[PDB]
Every structure is written in C-alpha cells, then in structure tokens.
C-alpha cells in the first residue's frame, strides 16, 4: 500500500512585473536579476488577496466531490498568517466544502511548514488508508520596495491531496530532518516585513542541504547517481544551484551535467513566479512533473525542504505509473500566461497599499476567493 501525492496544483495572483522592468526602475543592469539571482517575472498581489485566497484557488483546482467526503484533515503551512489564533485551514475547510468531521490547523516553521504538513499527512493516511488529507502551502513573500530581497519576492500557494495508492508520487520512508537554532531570517510579532541576514541565510541554506544530504547518504547509501531528479526549496533559482554545485563537484562530468539539467527543468515555473516560501519546493516539484521530459514511472525524485530558523529535511518520492495523466500543465500555463503585466508604478502602488483590518470596508476584486469585505476585523471572501 503506497502513500503520497495523488494530485497537486499551484496558484499565483493574476499580476506580475518583468524583472528587466524592475531592474531599470532600480537603476541597475537590467540583467543582474535574470542572471545574478535567476528570476524573470515576479508574482504580485493586491491587498484584496491573501493566503486563503490562494489556498482556496489552488485546492479548488484538484478537489472532487468524492475527495471532499474522504478528507478528514486540512493543513495549511504558512508564515504569512492573518490571525495569531484562528488557523487559516478552518476557513479553507469551509470554502472547499470539505465534510465536517475533520481536524484543521495551521503549521508554522518558515518555508518548511508545508513539508511538515505533507509528512504528517502521509503518516495519517498510512494508518487510515481510506482517508485523504489536503495540505496547502500558502505565502506572500514581500521584503519591501527598494529592499535587498525585493527581487526574490513572490506570492501564491501549492495544494496537495495526500492519499493511499497515489496517482503521482509515492513517498518513501527515508526522511532525514535537521533542526538548528539560527537567525538567518525571521519575523518578530508585529513586523510586517522580515528581519533578514542575507549572508547567514545563503550559508545556512547551503550547509543545511550538505548536512541532511550527507546524513541521508550515510543512512541509505543513496547518492546523486541514484536520483533521476532533485526538487529544491529555493529563495531564488541561483541559490539552489549554489547548494547543488557545492555538493556535486566530485561526481562525473556527465552526472553533473545531468543533475544541473534536471535542476534547470525544476525551476522553469519559479523563474516566472518568485519565492513562495512554504510553496517553493512544491512549485519545483510541479515544474519537474510537467516540464521534465526524461522522467518516467519508477524514477526517484529527491526533495530538499528548507526553512529558515532553521529546519530542513530530505526525503524521496517515486513517480507512479500514469502520473503524466494527472497533472495540470494546461491550467498552470494559462494561469501564468494570462496574468496582467504591471508597470513599476502600478506595482509599487499595489505593493505599498495596506489593508487596515481595523476599518470596516468592502473590497472590489474579480478573483474568486478574494477578500470582499472586512467587518469588525473579520474577513469575508467572495466565493
């Protein structure tokens, strides 16, 4: 009895700004974003769209009436929460029309939250193979206009349906996790933007991959030659490549070329979206599934999840025969291609706008599940 990802999809807001345009606005070479950090288009969202908006849209793309009856646990991994007490998963459970007898909660641990949700969901289904779990990564990565991390911004969500006999990825039991108390990135209660140490963050991310990889190789004997592809969590596409390069220098030239090629395929979507925090790794998985042409049933996919703070985990998934018939490539490509390009001026205006929850008001937004009103701080969503 296999357990894993049966269906998976991502959602990003209907807006974006071109990185060449941003570079010019920031008076820098129109290419240090395309080649330096490796980003081409950045996802941007108005104040009328939050993690629930994204989580709801992504989940709607994969849930059938039968799934809604079989799901008895809803989990949202995020570091962009809108309430200190009420889990965003409760609202998602309502909007998705999931059956009432289910537990719902939010998991927090930076960009690692959704991974924790996925593993816990896996265990749940392993013990109750007739049930399913909805795990959704949702985040809004905003650093600030004219900020150091501004170029790495992103927003969206990745929804996953975990079930027994999954049709896409069967998860293995070779998990290797690590916890280290390091302040590379964090966001004190009350801070709308995160505190970030770039140098320490790059270093901790690269070293954490090296550490869980080495420990994983000790325990399993599995090396790069044993992996058909690797999905990485990434703040920006070049970080991941950096972490990979630092560990594959002793592999054969052909193997290095193969690994780096698989990596490039895993970041196709990311270059058009930006950092999704909890959802970055999973956007990478989706990219591999829909864009990596050499992958086939039985192939082994290695996944490296990272979370500042910091927590990391490496685990493996096996592609299920017929997975290609259960993807959302058409939907995803249309979602990206149909976005409206914003000028830098429109972008800064949309980015700087603040939603004051303390003010009763109504909001206009055509997007389904967007915030429609605020009353006594409570958000209403247009479904």
Q: Which is nearer to a copy of itself, 109 or 290 (by Cβ)? A: 109
Q: What is the contact mask toward a copy of itself in residues 99 to 128, using x (rule: CB under 8 A)?
A: -xxxxxxxxxxx-xx--x--xx--xx-xx-
Q: Rule CB under 6 A: choose which of 29, 173, 214, 356 binds ligand COA.
A: 29
Nearer to ligand COA, 280 or 370 (CB): 280
Nearest to 115 by CA among 259, 276, 267: 276
CB atoms within 10 A of CB 277: 29
Q: For residue 151, state whether it binds ligand COA (rule: CB under 6 A).
A: yes
130 binds a copy of itself (CB under 8 A): no
Binding flag, residue 264, a copy of itself (CB under 8 A): no
Return the structure tokens found at 35: 């080649």
Strand order in the sheet with 371-375: 361-362, 371-375, 378-381
Q: Classify 282 in phi/psi space as left (phi over 0), alpha (psi -120 to 50) or beta.
A: alpha
265 binds, among ligand COA, a copy of itself, none (CB under 5 to 8 A by kind): none
**Which residue in the block uniquely carries the two structure tokens 């703040």?**
235
Q: Which stretch binds a copy of itself (CB under 8 A): 80-88, 143-151, 268-276, 294-302?
A: 80-88
**Phi-psi sector, 366: left (phi>0), alpha (psi -120 to 50), beta:** alpha
Question: Between helices 253-266 and 280-291, what is the axis angle to 10°?
Answer: 110
Q: Within a 10 A sphere around the Cβ of 126, how many other Cβ atoms?
A: 15
Distances (CA, A) of 341 to 41, 55, 62, 338: 9, 22, 27, 9
CB atoms inside a 10 Å sphere around CB 191: 9
Which residue among 99, 123, 173, 198 contacts ligand COA (CB under 6 A)? 198
On the 0-12 / 13-18 / 19+ scale of CB atoms within 10 A, 20 is middle
**Shortest Å, Cβ 23 to ligand COA:** 8
The alpha carbon torsion through 159, 164, 165, 166 (nearest 10 deg) reads: 10
**Cα end-to-end distance, the chain, whole Å:** 37
By CB under 8 A, residue 191 contacts a copy of itself: yes
- The answer to whether 196 contacts ligand COA (rule: CB under 6 A) is yes
Q: Which residue is nearest to ligand COA (CB)?
A: 36
Find residue 140's DSSP bridge partners: 155
CB distance 374 to 360 below 8 Å: yes
Distances (CA, A) of 330 to 58, 138, 267, 320: 14, 21, 17, 20
Looking only at residues 234 through 263 of this chain, which bind ligand COA when binding is defined by CB under 6 A? Answer: 235-236, 238-239
Pick one of a copy of itself, ligand COA, none as the site partner of residue 104 (Cβ within 5 to 8 A by kind). Answer: a copy of itself
Which of a copy of itself, ligand COA, none does residue 206 bind (CB under 5 to 8 Å by kind)? none
**Buried b / exposed e along 54-66 (16+ C-beta atoms within 10 A):** bbbbbbbbbbeee
Task: Select the residue interacting with a copy of itself from 308, 316, 328, 370 (CB under 8 A).
Answer: 308
366: contact with a copy of itself by CB under 8 A: no
The distance of closest approach from Cβ of residue 280 to ligand COA in the complex, given in angstroms and rounded to an integer, is 9
Nearest residue (CB) to ligand COA, 277 versus 381: 277
CA pair distance 233, 254, nearest whole angstrom: 24
Distance CA 32, CA 23 (A): 8
**Residues noted as catalytic:** 79, 111, 233
With CB under 6 A as the contact rule, which of the stretches 132-140, 231-239, 259-267, 346-354 interacts with ligand COA? 231-239
| Contact mark string toward ligand COA, 78..107, x via CB under 6 A | ------------------------------
Q: Could you tell which of ligand COA, a copy of itself, none binds residue 239, using a CB distance below 5 to 8 A set by kind?
A: ligand COA
Q: What residue ranges bind ligand COA (CB under 6 A)?
A: 29, 31-32, 35-37, 148-149, 151-152, 185, 196, 198, 201-202, 205, 235-236, 238-239, 306
Q: What residue ranges bind a copy of itself (CB under 8 A)?
A: 72-74, 79-87, 89-91, 93-94, 98, 100-110, 112-113, 116, 119-120, 123-124, 126-127, 173, 176-181, 183, 185-191, 194-195, 215, 307-311, 313, 357-358, 376-378
């Amino acid at each position: 009895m296999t357990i894993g990802i049966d269906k998976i999809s991502f959602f990003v807001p209907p807006y974006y700004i071109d990185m060449t345009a941003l570079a010019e606005a920031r008076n820098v070479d129109p290419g240090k974003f395309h080649i330096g950090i490796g980003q081409d288009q950045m996802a941007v969202n108005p104040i009328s769209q939050d993690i629930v908006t994204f989580a709801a849209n992504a989940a709607e793309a994969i849930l059938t009436k039968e799934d809604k009856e079989a799901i008895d646990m809803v989990i949202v991994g995020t570091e962009s929460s809108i309430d200190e007490s009420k889990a965003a998963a409760v609202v998602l459970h309502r909007l998705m029309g999931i059956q009432p007898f289910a537990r719902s909660f939010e998991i927090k641990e930076a960009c690692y939250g959704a991974t924790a949700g996925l593993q816990l969901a896996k265990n749940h289904v392993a013990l109750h193979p007739d049930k399913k779990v909805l795990v959704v990564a949702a985040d809004i990565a905003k650093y600030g206009l004219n900020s150091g991390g501004e170029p790495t911004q992103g927003a969206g969500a990745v929804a996953m349906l975990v079930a027994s006999e999954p049709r896409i990825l069967a998860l293995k039991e070779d998990n290797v996790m690590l916890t280290q108390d390091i302040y590379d990135f964090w966001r004190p209660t009350g801070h709308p933007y995160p505190m970030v140490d770039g140098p320490l963050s790059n270093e901790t991310y690269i070293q954490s991959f090296a550490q869980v990889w080495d420990e994983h190789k000790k325990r399993t004997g599995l090396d790069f030659a044993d992996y058909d592809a690797l999905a990485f969590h990434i703040p920006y596409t070049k970080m991941g490549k950096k972490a990979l390069l630092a560990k594959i220098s002793d592999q054969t030239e052909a193997e290095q070329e193969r690994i780096l090629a698989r990596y490039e395929e895993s970041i196709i979507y990311s270059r058009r979206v930006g950092n999704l925090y909890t959802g970055s790794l999973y956007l990478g998985l989706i990219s591999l599934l829909e864009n990596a042409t050499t992958l086939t049933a039985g192939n082994q996919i290695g996944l490296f999840s990272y979370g500042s703070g910091a927590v990391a985990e490496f685990f493996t998934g096996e592609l299920v025969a017929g997975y290609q018939n259960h993807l959302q490539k058409e939907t995803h490509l249309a979602l990206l291609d149909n976005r409206t390009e914003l000028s830098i001026a429109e972008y800064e205006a949309m980015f700087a706008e603040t939603l004051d929850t303390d003010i009763d008001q109504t909001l206009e937004d055509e997007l389904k599940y967007s915030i429609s009103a605020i009353n006594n701080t409570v958000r209403s969503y247009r479904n």
